[PDB]
Subunit: 400 residues, 2 copies
Amino acid sequence: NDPVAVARGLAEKWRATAVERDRAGGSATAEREDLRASGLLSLLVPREYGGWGADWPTAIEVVREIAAADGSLGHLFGYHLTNAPMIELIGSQEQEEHLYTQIAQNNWWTGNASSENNSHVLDWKVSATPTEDGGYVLNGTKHFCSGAKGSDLLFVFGVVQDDSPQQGAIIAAAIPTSRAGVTPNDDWAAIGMRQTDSGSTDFHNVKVEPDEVLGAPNAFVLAFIQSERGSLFAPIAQLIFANVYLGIAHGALDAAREYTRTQARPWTPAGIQQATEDPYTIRSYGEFTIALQGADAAAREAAHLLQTVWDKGDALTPEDRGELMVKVSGVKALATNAALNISSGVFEVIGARGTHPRYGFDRFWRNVRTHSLHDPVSYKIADVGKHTLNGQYPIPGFTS
Amino acid sequence: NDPVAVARGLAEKWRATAVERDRAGGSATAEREDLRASGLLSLLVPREYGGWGADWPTAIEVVREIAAADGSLGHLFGYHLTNAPMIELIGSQEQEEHLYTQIAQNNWWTGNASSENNSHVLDWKVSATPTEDGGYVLNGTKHFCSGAKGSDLLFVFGVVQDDSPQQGAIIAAAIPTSRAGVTPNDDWAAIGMRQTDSGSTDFHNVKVEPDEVLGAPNAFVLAFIQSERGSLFAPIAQLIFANVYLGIAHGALDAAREYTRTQARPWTPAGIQQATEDPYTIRSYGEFTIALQGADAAAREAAHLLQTVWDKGDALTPEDRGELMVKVSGVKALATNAALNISSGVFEVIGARGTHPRYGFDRFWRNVRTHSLHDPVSYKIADVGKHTLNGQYPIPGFTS
């Protein structure tokens, strides 16, 4: 009924273990179970199929709530949300009905071992060999996945690399993570985003049934070229990422605020009497708040635009998609730079004693600093620039 | 007799284990021994007493080289260098001859358990109780020390808090760290500066002998009020800190450069062929370099000014000290800002694979994010502003 309230409940529960979990790293097994039990995994699945049928702005509010409590869980959950929509972006009506129903009925976690955003297709590690029955066999190791480990349903891409008619095609499929031959490894380590389970997954002679293949061979690339509905992949993922960062930024700001009010001491050599009345501390909080004020407002407008474009279905035009991606690109930039600035900047007001690991105050920065590198913010900014000056739209792809 | 070359040798040696040492934290036992063996501990001790007799600019270059290798070791060594000068600043010539000679001949580490920079004196934790023979007994626990643990000679402050004529005076002393009742604890933990040994030290009925008391009771406070030679305490320490930050920034920049050249991949969706030819990567390296170019140049000028004021001895004037502190305050701000900006910003050019803990790339940011909070940069900036607008000099103290 009120997924945001549910998210708030989880956030409250998770704040108590936030420091220890960041320190420990590894999979957040108990928290993934909390999410499973909450029902939120089917947030975006249509109510027709047992899901919550939430709109994009609402699902984003949930992501933000979770991200503020825990950057890793925010990304884990937010990215999970982007997987199933692929089914209606490039998959068939039959697949939509079947898989949406199973996901909501079974409260499935979804994961991906999908695109290699910065490799030419014939160099991708996971190959797809066509079989006589119209399916494929997957082989190879996807070195960077998102939530494969711990997932029930895995959205995987492979490239046909033999010399058949499908040579070079990206094959998208949704298969059970528990299928023999699929090995999601426990090898994720990073300065931040430590509990996102973003390690490697091995595929050893993994069969993909014809009916598990989403769209035609190379459907995603064909959709990108045409700015068809499948080209909504990037604006959706990018807007979710931007909101994860904004959530992390709010988490950092609120943690700092509580510390300034309760633990911080005034700088007595400056004659300050109360930490909360230091004029530079006051200015810093104003600046943090104002940076988020603009970033959040922009992000909210972008979600409404995404809702509009989404609701057009296959009637969307390349212009609709391009205008959306430009707006989202700007939000990704605003969120990246606000979150980095705030998550680092709050230390100035917290002070020396707050560097103790018991506070884990650097987890916010480490989390944003890590994920913000998924794709280069410099080209987000450039895409916006090319639109402003030249009226040009981003070239659709996995990150633009 | 090229101490900088010796320091470069150590930096080389320390390279293979920089990541592991930051990860492990604790005390840098092996590296402290390397420094002991190198002879550098007596860098600023006059040649007449067995030391190198290096000037401030040279000593600072040594600190910078070490800080670039390892921020903790840079702080540890640089802060150690600031201890013995106290003997000249407020102690007698007899004490100079005695203590400088011991430090140099024994290759001693010096540590401190000195000022509580943000507490009124009657609230300081370490009390000093005068004794019949003209010495004192120390009691209490200094909660934040610098290299007390692992030191051979400890510079300690206590406050006279009994009803006596010396009531409220700060007593400075230099005692062997092994003096009965001194217990440097192994309780240092922080997000960065992990091997600086900055934990607490307990004093249980610790006797300070009459000849170990440096200057009259309250000598430092009296020297501050008059801008006497003792007031060089802050400009020395502050300039050292700024240069530790600059060293850390260079370390980060160099780590990034090597990674960009050898490991980074071009962003192929933008059509880039070589990571080293990306125009935004090039711009970022330019901005990092330029920020350090300005901060380093200002730092160098400040070191020359410190040398000039130092060389005046007791003839320095309050204006001399004031102009110096204003300059150093500016360097502290420049170094802080540059080091935070670079140590965070290099991630943008390194990219997602560089977030793996095996690279330890966040250690640079964690180190400067931590120490930069020692005293508030906002008041460094304000002190400069007050000089610029009003011609006012900073009020001399332990941090200004």
